[PDB]
Ligand binder design. Sequence first.
Ligand code: 64R
Length: 125
Amino acid sequence: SMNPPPPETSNPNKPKRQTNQLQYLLRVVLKTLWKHQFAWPFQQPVDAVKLNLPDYYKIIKTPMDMGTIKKRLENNYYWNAQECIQDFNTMFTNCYIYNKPGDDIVLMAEALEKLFLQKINELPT
Ligand SMILES: Cc1ccc2c(c1)NC(=O)[C@@H](C)O2
């Protein structure tokens, strides 16, 4: 099959936590980025079959997307904010790795990453 199984959104072995900052990442950061005009490519795992990108997972080995992150946050999958933020960053870097500078999808990611940075610049205490 061209698509791998999607990243886990739960894990019984992994310890959960809820924090003010993780709460913020879901209610404010994720759910605001979600509403951006450029959010749609990043709202679900890359479907290599659907998007006709047969080489995507030959290149990207740590896929990540906001749909996954959203479910992780809802499941309280994360231990801390940093874990969630590194997922966001993985998603953006994946886009820059797979695509070329100037590509439309890259312009989109660049715009979201800027907004993402603006919102995590200050987190609740
Ligand atoms: C055609 C197409 C649609 C959506 C897309 C892409 C390519 N390329 C990507 O890297 C992902 C994240 O988003």
